Ligand binder design. Structure first.
Ligand SMILES: O=C(O)CNC(=O)C(=O)O
Ligand SMILES: [Mg+2]
Ligand code: NI
Ligand SMILES: [Zn+2]
Length: 331
């Protein structure tokens, strides 16, 4: 078995190998990359997402989210308070202000220490889940706005035509902005490209060990657990690496820098934080190997997780018994 210790793998495709997206994902899996839950892909040196970022300041962040924490430094939840709209240029100025900017630090490890020590005492503002793309339309390779769609994959594998569309989302981050422990909707893959700015640190649990994370989460968030049988779908809970280590949960960590892709694999729990002002783009995708994960994916039916139009069809076709109760949650 390849990559039996479930380490995060880093790949360096040539421009020739960067032509066929599906093929390269299958290659990475042939080397065991999926076992980690997360992989890094460094694009060929000749490749670019677009010519410059000089003209992005007038993108609107219609609903910036202030991420307010409750709990203890290593075990907390966050809620998102909606703020007034601002442009990317306004947000970047805010991120660089004395109140919100990255503190002085020695290296990524020192900054990681400061994050876990101090995150709960601040409420950074996140521009998340903004439909759109920063890839130039002429970028032919690994353009996240030109991927094959999950509906087309399901149709190719299973023969059923379904409604729904699949488009990318932009994320504008600042120091301490946080992504809670989650897997993707319907335990899909994701791909994330860091277009610009400061790094993003990731934590991930191997798919084969995901239930160990879930059992810890039920112990650490006991009222949330009683409220919903899949409360990590709410995307609100954080657990530090120190706490994971104290409880024997297998995980790995890596820092993504501007110009790099990350791929998350089906049922790979992940969480993380941004180091400073940055912009990422991400989208879900599927392969044939995903279908079995989609069939088995947990669902939130308490009503909190409330997700896309396109997830309907996935539940209806892959999980017809759940369909009924899940849609009661979504209506
Ligand atoms: O970058 C972020 O804030 C969150 N991204 C992801 O969870 C992803 O790409 O799967
Ligand atoms: Mg603009
Ligand atoms: Ni994700
Ligand atoms: Zn729920």
């Amino acid at each position: 078995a390849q990559n039996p210790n479930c380490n995060i793998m880093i790949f360096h495709p040539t421009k020739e190998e960067f032509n066929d997206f599906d093929k390269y994902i299958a290659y990475m899996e042939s080397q065991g990359a999926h076992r980690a839950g997360l992989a890094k892909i460094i694009p060929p040196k000749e490749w670019k997402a677009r010519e410059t970022y000089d003209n992005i300041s007038e993108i609107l962040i219609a609903t910036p989210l202030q991420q307010v924490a409750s709990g203890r430094a290593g075990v907390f939840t966050q809620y998102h308070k909606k703020k007034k709209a601002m442009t990317v240029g306004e947000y970047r100025h805010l991120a660089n202000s004395k109140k919100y900017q990255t503190p002085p630090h020695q290296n990524f490890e020192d900054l990681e220490r400061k994050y876990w020590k101090n995150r709960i005492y601040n409420s950074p503002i996140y521009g998340a889940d903004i439909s759109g793309s920063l890839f130039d339309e002429n970028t032919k390779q690994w353009n996240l706005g030109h991927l094959g769609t999950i509906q087309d994959l399901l149709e190719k594998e299973c023969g059923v035509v379904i409604e729904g569309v699949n488009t990318p989302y932009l994320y504008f981050g600042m120091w301490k902005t946080t992504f809670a422990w989650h897997t993707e909707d319907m335990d899909l893959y994701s791909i994330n490209y860091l277009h610009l700015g400061e790094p993003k640190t990731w934590y991930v649990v191997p798919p084969e060990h995901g239930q160990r994370l879930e059992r810890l989460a039920r112990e650490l968030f006991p009222g949330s657990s009683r409220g919903c049988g899949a409360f990590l779908r709410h995307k609100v809970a954080l657990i530090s690496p120190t706490v994971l280590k104290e409880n024997g949960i297998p995980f790995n960590r890596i820092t993504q820098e501007a110009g790099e892709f990350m791929v998350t694999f089906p049922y790979g729990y992940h969480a993380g934080f941004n180091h400073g002002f940055n912009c990422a783009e991400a989208i879900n995708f599927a392969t044939p190997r995903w279908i079995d994960y989609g069939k088995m994916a947990s669902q939130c039916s308490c009503g909190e997780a409330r997700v896309t139009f396109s997830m309907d069809a996935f539940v209806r076709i892959l999980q017809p018994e759940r369909y009924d109760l899940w849609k009661r949650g979504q209506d």
